[PDB]
Symmetry: D2
Subunit: 335 residues, 4 copies
């Protein structure tokens, strides 16, 4: 059977095809984020008018379904078709990970605890340098945007793709969007902790990496972070909503990152997101949510989704545990 150690349900049948057109999905009650789904869609209308035009009828259809009852048994009653996904094992288990938008403090000039530079997009040959070399000073100081008080925060923000920069002087939070990356492949840092016997395999998470950095010295932290030759460059947007690859403001848990080749942007997705406590342990229950694919990821390929948790600490704690599975139905309207 499918060990539910990471949330693997099997109460639907046996659907192997990519888009398994089921009559109506397995679920009790209405989705938890109905009104929240409306906001997400509204953003698609103003931020991507061409993407909205292609999915107008789809969005308008599910809205009435939510305003009437919301039960996954009253979908076809409005011409909505649920196309279940095969997932990993092809039995019905789609991978679910998570990411958020962290807020970090920094200064325009280095001072005191602020000695860690955040770089912008450099020239063609400047993007060749690895993370370790950049730490040593491979890039010119004119490409620095700010200096943070934590090398770990910069690394986490690097992994997330973006983040708000708080200068702590009164000015609004500047959104440092994903502008580009260096010519080096991304390599797992948490794995390096397991390679030398520093962190447990079963107890691998966001809090473990952060706790490790506080337990060890700066030299030991820098050495570990350098094991990831990849480095991300940002572009200041100045208090703009969190936007992904689709250039549409992402809403907390109402949007996900996907493989554009399989699941294109603007795709409505209803899924059973597995719940977990503060310790990230799978309790056994799920959560019905309506989300839209509006972002991409280097590690997000095939039957895999990256649920956008939100902005802030609480959104980060919730995002670090997500490496579970669950079912998902691609919602399409009848022609």
């Amino acid at each position: 059977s499918k060990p539910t150690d990471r949330g693997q349900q099997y109460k639907d049948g046996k659907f192997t095809q990519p888009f398994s057109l089921v009559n109506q999905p397995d679920a009790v009650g209405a989705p938890i984020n109905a009104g929240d789904f409306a906001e997400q869609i509204n953003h698609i209308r103003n931020s991507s008018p061409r993407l909205y035009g292609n999915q107008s009828n789809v969005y308008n259809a599910v809205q009435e379904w939510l305003r009437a009852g919301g039960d996954t048994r009253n979908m076809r009653q409005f011409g909505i078709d649920a196309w279940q996904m095969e997932g990993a094992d092809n039995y019905g288990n789609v991978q679910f990970t998570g990411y958020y938008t962290p807020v970090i403090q920094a200064r325009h000039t280095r001072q005191g605890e602020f000695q860690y530079p955040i770089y912008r997009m450099p020239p063609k040959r400047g993007r060749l340098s690895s993370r370790a070399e950049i730490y040593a000073g491979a890039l010119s100081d004119k490409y620095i945007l700010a200096y943070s008080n934590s090398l770990m925060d910069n690394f986490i923000m690097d992994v997330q793709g973006s983040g708000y920069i708080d200068f702590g002087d009164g000015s609004p939070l500047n959104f440092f969007s994903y502008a580009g990356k260096n010519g080096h492949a991304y390599r797992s840092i948490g794995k390096v902790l397991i390679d030398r016997g520093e962190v447990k395999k079963e107890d691998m998470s966001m809090q473990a990496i952060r706790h490790w950095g506080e337990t060890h010295s700066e030299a030991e932290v820098r050495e570990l972070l350098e094991q990831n030759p990849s480095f991300v460059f940002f572009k200041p947007q100045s208090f703009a909503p969190v936007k992904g690859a689709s250039a549409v403001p992402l809403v907390g848990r109402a949007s996900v990152a996907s493989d554009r080749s399989i699941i294109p942007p603007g795709t409505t997705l209803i899924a059973e997101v597995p719940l977990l406590d503060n310790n990230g342990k799978f309790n056994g229950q799920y959560e019905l949510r309506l989300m839209v694919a509006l972002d991409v990821g280097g590690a997000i390929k095939g039957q895999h989704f990256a649920i956008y948790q939100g902005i802030g600490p609480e959104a980060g704690h919730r995002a670090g545990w997500y490496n579970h599975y669950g079912r998902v139905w691609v919602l399409k309207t009848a022609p």
Copy 2:
């Protein structure tokens, strides 16, 4: 015959107790404002430490319930007891009105279209003057805060209790909170219009009032508005969140105004809010929302609630329609 033109529903029977302990509420699905409610709780937590301290048990219970997918049936596992309100008709149906926070365009000094003063709290004897007298100049110019471009906007804001003031110069919107009122009783203008013979009986709305003001001249608008001797004074909070009587930042459609004697502040309320189109016509469907009583009103007494729609024009259009009914349950703890 049982009226259903407004938005009444008779199927849960007649309730004798002001609060009938019904296990599972007659909900259509799940809370569509999980994020709005959670936000509202966090606002009470940081703005009203003692009010939150007492209702914290309920707040943590309903949030954990919302986490479980917001299952209106499984909420009993969390010990959440639903006490359905008897309603104004004792059939579970309760009156639902609405108010919002209008954004008024103004200037510090009178110029061009900006010739309508917004006053602050004057001395004891200055608060005796009626609206008509204040329009003629009963108050000193040193009590003026700003000059708007519409007498109708000032009147609507007066009725709402507060509103944001946009100076259109780059500076943030200043929140003019309810500071006080004059020594004259309030008299509805909607009644005056019907009785005057201009506006029709059933064809009354806050929209028709705004349209009427644009159809008629300044002298005709002023004369009509003077039929309401009451006048509200404001106090600029300088870009502060919209706060009500409880001094807690109000969240759009996640908070309501109530009679503190019957429904005290901090009370969690799950309700079936009747939906209505752009023309304010009751289509027939409802909406499940979790709201908290955090404000009061002069016309809000007994079995009656004033749903805080939000900030802006869209929030105003949605607010100036509500004179309908719907079911509501007062969420509490064990008996």
Copy 3:
């Protein structure tokens, strides 16, 4: 023949060259916007690190001058030069015009008074359409950003190059930066008002629009075939060509060929009342060239007034002259 209405000077003599190095400028005394200038300096540091690197010396040179005091007679003790610019009449009268960042209210969807679209950058062939054609609907609705309540406001913002958009719903003001323009040359509106004779400034044109009907206003505005496209920066500071946040009356638009960006300029800006009449007195200010303009060529500057109505009233009247010195480091 020999006017002094626009603040023209003669008390300096003819200038035989564009820039003349003096010793103690003919200015009044101490600058008023010493603080605003400092705010402009760090803005260049944060925004354009390359520009701040080449002019770091100049910014710090004048930084010590104002720190102590700010007397125009004594500047050499801080290592500063004073290259006095000439003018049209060659008497040091540098032309000073003005522009600001207007705040226009609008919604995402057309409703009521909001029926005037604000467009973004369309494709290559979509940029060929003239203003009159775009008004009639030459561009697709998917290129619309917002709908304003005034066609005149959209036109003024079009002329200014940018503007803040207030959606009146609580959300922050979205800065619609200059993204591009259409394939048509700019035509003057006052020009058309002279043809049939009806009227002069940005204040006189605004009054004309209020006096005449919508059909008469649209017809006049269509006389300018040029149309500007914007790009929402989502609540970002007002930036010009140099991509540096502009500070009110502490920055100006110039001809990059003559006066390159990052150049410090101390000038005697001619004052004027609410009616735009030159009273006779000047104002000493320190400003930096951080923007450009299509009509800003040669010995001419466009003083950035600021954001809002008051900044617009002040900018619409500005078409006067004044002296200006290019502050550089002593060799």
Copy 4:
């Protein structure tokens, strides 16, 4: 016996009165903060039309003078009466101190480095507790507004009278205004370290001391000041003082309302000092308005409002010098 190390002078002559009508001010230069001064008048015109309504006569005179060049040699041509103040030494030099509005980062709930509570106005009997007792938990947790990451920052903000609170979550900076104080007299930590023999006082030097020593050592030192200030959140409102008028950086000062009432225009020779707070020897001409008060600001003494932020704090902590000042009024 005439000191000059702290900015004091003698080229003005000894005074016989607090204020004296001077036909021509003994100071060369021009108001280098004319823009900041004009900004203050607009703030007094919007935030307090009552005080402005009776102080306009002086502003209109100092504005007409400013617009018409701004040369101190023509002030009488606009109706501006200069009044030389004696200060500490009857030679025209007044004691100039400074304060600013610190931006502190804090959270609504205690977590990690954020373990230092910022309290609001408690009941009558709750205001009796001293700082040391409050640190130990004399006040209930329901009176806490936020938890900062530095006990020193809280102390400095306490001395300043107010400060902006940055929650680092996106929300605007909340201005914690001076709501009240406890029933204990203020004791400067400066006098403590001066007597202890650990000074090279400098209110910023103590900041370095706090970072050098541990939490227990910092708390112990701070407990020497029994006074404790309570704040009131205004949520992104301009820095306002006692006059309830938004203060402008170095264009406003705190004064003794009995001697120098609020709304009073003051032109002064503010003594300049380097990064190390050493008096170089030069001054600075500034136009300022009295719009705030202070417990230690009595008689011939002013507290120059430096501004908001770190740089404003470094500049403020050094001020303990002297300089000449003229009370600008109208000519009868």
